[PDB]
Amino acid sequence: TIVVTTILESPYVMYKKNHEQLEGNERYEGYCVD
């Protein structure tokens, strides 16, 4: 598994709606997540 470092910065990487009930990569959304 590749470890990808990134940064919380809108709209590149943001916490998803309901992230606390999600895990791993699914916690995040945005341009850089895509």
Query: Reduced to 3 states, what is the DSSP secondary structure of residue 33?
Result: coil
Q: Give CA–CA dist 18/1, Å, rounded.
A: 25
What DSSP string runs through 4-22?
-----BTTTBEEPTTGGG-
The coordinates were experimentally obtained by cryo-EM
CB count within 10 Å of CB 16 equals: 14
Resolution of the solved structure (Å): 10.3
* Opening angle at CA 27, ends 25 and 33, nearest 5: 55
> Three-state DSSP class for 1?
coil
